[PDB]
Amino acid sequence: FPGRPDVAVEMRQLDFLLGDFRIEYTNLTTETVTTGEATCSTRPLADGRFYELTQRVPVPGLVATWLIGWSDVDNRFVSFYYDDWGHHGRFTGPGWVDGHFKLTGDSAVFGARHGFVEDFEIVDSDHLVKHGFVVVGDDLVPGDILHFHRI
Numbered sequence: 001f002p003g004r005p006d007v008a009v010e011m012r013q014l015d016f017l018l019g020d021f022r023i024e025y026t027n028l029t030t031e032t033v034t035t036g037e038a039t040c041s042t043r044p045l046a047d048g049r050f051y052e053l054t055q056r057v058p059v060p061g062l063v064a065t066w067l068i069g070w071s072d073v074d075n076r077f078v079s080f081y082y083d084d085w086g087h088h089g090r091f092t093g094p095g096w097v098d099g100h101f102k103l104t105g106d107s108a109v110f111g112a113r114h115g116f117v118e119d120f121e122i123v124d125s126d127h128l129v130k131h132g133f134v135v136v137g138d139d140l141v142p143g144d145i146l147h148f149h150r151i
Contacts, residue, residue, distance in 0.1 A: 007048050010070035010077070013095050014051050016122055017042040021148035025057065028142045029134070040148070066091075068103075079103055091118065116143070126150040 020041050027034035040055040050069035057064065064083035071078045074092070081089035089107025101120040106113055115135030122128055128148035133140035 005072075008070040008072060010095060011048065011051075013070075013101070014042075014068060014077075016120075016125075016128065017051065017053060018044075020151040021128070022151055023055070024147040024149070026145045028144055039151075077103070079105070081105075081107055085109075089116065091116075 021039065023038040023040055025034075025036055025038050027036075036057075036059060038055060038057045040053060042051055042053040044050070045052045045067070046069075050067050053066040053068070055064045055066075056062075062083055062085060064081065064087075066079055066081050068077055068079040068091075070076075077093045077095065079091040079093075081087070081091065087107060087109045089105055089109075091103035091105030093101065093103040095101065099121060103118045103120075104116075106115050117133040117135075117140060119131040119133065120128060121130075126149065130144075130146040130148070132143035132145070134143040135141075
């Protein structure tokens with residue numbers, strides 16, 4: 001068998017997520033715009049070859065995990081989502097492109113499969129924003145916005 005390859009340099013594109021963040025989550029698809037506070041922690045797994053983002057959303061009652069890593073063979077990030085409600089999803093993205101880090105894929109949530117786009121941007125080293133969109137028909141409907149402030 002060959003030697004163990006080095007961590008892909010592309011993994012440095014995810015370092016902006018490392019650490020603990022307080023989340024101001026604004027849910028836009030409810031018929032009253034919810035808004036609330038959550039937390040999340042991102043740690044490297046598998047000797048830094050994959051990152052695990054755990055998002056604990058208190059009052060819905062939901063712990064959601066994202067695993068993300070670079071795939072040499074695919075030339076893109078790949079990501080697996082799952083939570084303690086039974087939901088799962090598959091995402092991919094190219095990396096940072098024009099100031100956004102977009103993951104595109106689909107998830108089985110609440111009894112049906114939906115397309116989702118997670119759009120990450122850095123505001124400053126300690127403040128991230130994420131726009132979530134859900135494919136409805138042909139367009140992308142604003143699903144949520146999350147502000148991450150590092151603890």
